[PDB]
Every structure is written in C-alpha cells, then in structure tokens.
C-alpha cells in the first residue's frame, strides 16, 4: 500500500532483529532527497536506528557481493570491463553520506570499497570518489571521538583508517604525478625545438614559445620536486 508515513510507526512493534532486517529491504528502495529526509524524520520521531539500518544494508550488500578479488591486485582474464557490482557499490554511497553522523564507519566502508576497486582495477572510480569525499575525514573522525567524551574504549580502527587514507592519498598522488609526467613527455619537453625560423615574426614567436616553455618547465620542476620529496 506504500505510504512511507505509515511504515515506521508500525515497524517498531516488531522484534528488533526482524524489524531491522525488514527495514533494510524497505530502505534499499528509497530515492528523492525530500522523501529521504521525510523518512529520516519519521524514523527519528518513531525511535528507529536508521543509521545502523543503513550500515546493515551496506554490510548485507557487501556480503552478497562477496567482495571483488579480496584485497589483492588480481588482473582479470582476457579483456573485460568493470564488475556488475561496482554500480551498486558506488550507488549505495548516496544514502550512506546522506546522514553525516557515523563518519568513522563511513570512512571505513570507503576504505573497504577503495581496496575492492584497487583489487578489481578501478582507479578512475577511486579517483572520482576521492575527489568527491573531503580530505579531513580522519580529522573529523578524531574530533568526534574526542568530543563524544569516550576515550576509555579506544580501539585501533581510528589509526587503521588514518593509515589507509594516508596510503591511498600517497598512491593517488604518485599516480597523478606519473600521468602528468607522461603527458609532459608527450608534449614538447620545453626545449628550443627547431621548427623553421626565417622571419622576424617567426623569431618573435619562437622567442615567446621559448619563454613560455621555460616558465612551464620551471613550474613543472618545482611542483614535481615538491610532490616527489
């Protein structure tokens, strides 16, 4: 019968296990930001843990997908495109990021799907997701951890996420430096290449090109030396 304003007020009467297991499938098919925020407000008013519901949704989707080549670089057989589960993995992030409260688990799942993409060869999607997500993720994580006033039960998940994010950022910076260097090699190497000089305007254009090449070479060497250091 649909009507999302009547499901949360009746799910709470069910046992917690079955209620969560069914709210998972209920929220798996939810679109539109207005309807999403309406369901969020309804769940918050009824007293349902929609955050853990979405976390269990993501966990069930990952368990059904059974990962992608585990966490090891496994090259596909012959010629093939992307995996069929990558679309769902990249689409489930919308409802996960729609609730900014569980930043720790959000970054944990982001690192998990990043390892899955690195194993299944998806550096482009990895770069797009990294550009979409901010860089102060671990910063906000430890800020929330120190603001929640609960340092007695401090595990190692924060440090693991810090190390994972640092390694991912380093690998992405290395890859971007490599492709920028290759594109600069494909382009003229900022050297005075003889292309035919026999007039005043020709020599003026050649001098201007040499000056621009020197400036571009200086900027390239500077930023590449910084990144490589």
């Amino acid at each position: 019968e649909k009507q999302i304003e009547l499901i949360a007020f009746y799910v709470s009467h069910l046992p917690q296990e079955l209620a969560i297991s069914q709210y998972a499938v209920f929220l798996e098919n939810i679109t539109d930001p207005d309807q999403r925020q309406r369901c969020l407000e309804l769940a918050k008013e009824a007293g349902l843990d929609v955050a853990s519901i979405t976390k269990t949704v993501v966990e069930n989707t990952r368990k059904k997908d059974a990962g992608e080549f585990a966490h090891h670089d496994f090259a596909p057989a012959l010629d093939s495109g992307t995996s069929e589960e990558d679309r769902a993995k990249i689409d489930v992030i919308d409802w996960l990021v729609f609730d900014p409260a569980q930043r720790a688990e959000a970054l944990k799942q982001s690192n998990a799907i990043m390892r899955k993409f690195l194993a299944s060869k998806k550096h482009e999607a990895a770069k797009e997701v990294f550009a979409k997500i901010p860089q102060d993720s671990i910063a906000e994580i430890y800020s929330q951890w120190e603001e929640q006033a609960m340092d007695s039960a401090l595990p190692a998940e924060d440090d693991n996420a810090i190390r994972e994010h640092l390694c991912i950022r380093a690998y992405l910076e290395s890859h971007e430096a490599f492709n920028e260097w290759f594109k600069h090699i494909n382009s003229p190497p900022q050297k005075p290449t003889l292309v035919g000089q026999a007039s005043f305007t020709e020599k003026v254009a050649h001098e201007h090109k040499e000056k621009k090449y020197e400036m571009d070479f200086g900027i390239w060497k500077g930023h590449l030396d910084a990144l490589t250091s």
């Binding site: 012959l78 010629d79 495109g81 060869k121 482009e124 971007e176 492709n179 494909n186």
Partner: protein, 273 residues
C-alpha cells in the same frame, strides 16, 4: 487495426508528432510482427505491399520512424530486420556499429547469446552489402575496421597468438615504423567516435599479445630450446620498431585517455624497447 487507424489518421498534429503515429508505434512495438502486415523477407529483400501499404502511402518513412523509435526504446534485431525490409544500408550499418561497440569492451568468447546475435547481424549486414549498394565510404571503412577488429578479438580469445599477430600485421593499419606514424596520424583525423573509443581495448589486446610473445621468447632459450640468436635479435628489433612507432603515435596524436592506459602503453613500449 487498420479500420481504427483510418479514423485516427483524421486528427492533425497535437503537441509534437501525432496521436495516430503514437498509437501505431505502440501497437507495432507491442506486437512485433511484420512479415505480412509490412512485408515478407527472404534474407535481405525489399518491401512488399502490405495491408496498411495498400491503403496508405509514406510507408518507407513510417517504417523508418518506427525503427528509430524501437532503437531509441531498446530493440536491436527487430529494428535491424525492419530497416533491412525498408532498404536503408546507412541506418543498418549505423545500428550494427552502435550495437557491437559496447560488446567490444567486454569479452567475446561464446558464453551467452550476444555473440551469436552480433555474428548473425554481421552476416546479414555483409550479405546486404554484397547484394546491393552498401553505405557511404566512411561507413564501409568503419564496417571493415570493426570486422577486422572483432576477428582479431576472437582469434586472441580462442587462445592463439601467432594468428592474432599475423592478422594484426596484415591489417596494415597499426603504427609500423616512424615513417608510418605520419600517415597513421593523418588517417586518424578521418576516423569516428567509435574508432577513437575502441582504441583502448585494441591497445589492451595488442599489449597482451605482445607481452605473451615476450614471455614465450624469454622462456625459450637463446642458444638452446630452439630459436637461434639471430632470430631472437630480429624479433627484438621488430619489437623495438613496433614500440617506437606505437609510442610516437600515442604521443603525437591529439587525444589523451587515462593514467592506467597511458602507464600500460609506456609499459609495453619499454618491454618491447
């Protein structure tokens, strides 16, 4: 159906197209039958005066619009048969290329029915081109290119390496040497979107074949286990030439793709270097 269409056609246009056209399009896409209503087909014949054709004209344009609507919706074999009945080699080859382009990216081994569908579509297109006037010059060039590419793809997927190597050498379209990079770049400017997009998979298959050949050459002994040192040196020199031509092409073409593809390109370049 025709009795109702005779009354539906009396209404003029209303907010784009016509209600009669929309109704007949919905009916034909829900029925999927035209061997007696629009025209029978032996294998690639023309159109026949069907029931609706014996009362209304503009049948060619009607069939073309119906096939275009079916292609925009998501129909392939029936739209191809309809265009073959309406006699339109340009549109036939266009839809053939549009349906074979996304399958080139994935595998081509006999595992489902898409490969059989593309094979029968290619056979129908080639027999239509043989019996009658084909498409334009660029369209026929792209058709031959895609035929050779899928041939090399299936030859590589079947497990053979020497066959793929000799067909890719006889194609006479990959960068051979430095003096050939110029004409390769000159011909690249007259390609198409699909011809520029499938280059990724083409280079991937080429680098896979080249790496397999290099691994076999390294496993084979220089002085023992066959393959004399002179043959090894000749193979190394031809690999040097092929890599230099390919890297010059990829460096002086006005088109860039992705970091992974670029890294693999340079990897094969230095492997053969």
């Amino acid at each position: 159906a025709l009795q109702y269409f005779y009354f539906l056609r009396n209404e003029k246009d209303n907010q784009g197209e016509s209600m009669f056209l929309r109704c007949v399009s919905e009916l034909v896409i829900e029925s999927r039958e035209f061997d007696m209503l629009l025209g029978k087909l032996e294998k690639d014949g023309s159109r026949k005066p069907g029931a609706i054709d014996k009362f209304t004209r503009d049948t060619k344009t009607i069939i073309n619009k119906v096939a275009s609507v079916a292609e925009n919706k998501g129909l392939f074999e029936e739209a191809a048969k309809l265009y073959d009945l309406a006699k339109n080699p340009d549109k036939v080859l266009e839809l053939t290329n549009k349906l074979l382009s996304p399958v080139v990216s994935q595998i081509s081994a006999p595992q489902s029915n898409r490969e059989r569908l593309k094979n029968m579509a290619l056979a129908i297109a080639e027999r239509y081109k043989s019996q009658g006037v084909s498409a334009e010059k660029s369209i026929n060039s792209t058709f031959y290119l895609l035929l050779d590419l899928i041939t090399f793809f299936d030859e590589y997927h079947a497990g053979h390496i020497d066959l793929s190597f000799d067909v890719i050498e006889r194609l006479k379209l990959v960068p051979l040497s430095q003096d050939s990079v110029e004409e390769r770049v000159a011909a690249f400017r007259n390609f198409s979107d699909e011809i520029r997009h499938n280059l990724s998979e083409i280079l991937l298959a080429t680098m896979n074949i080249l790496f397999t050949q290099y691994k076999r050459l390294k496993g084979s002994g220089p002085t023992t286990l066959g393959r004399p040192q002179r043959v090894q040196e000749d193979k190394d020199s031809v690999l040097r030439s092929q890599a230099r031509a390919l890297i010059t092409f990829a460096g002086m073409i006005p088109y860039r793709m992705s970091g992974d593809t670029n890294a693999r390109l340079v990897q094969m370049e230095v492997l053969m270097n």
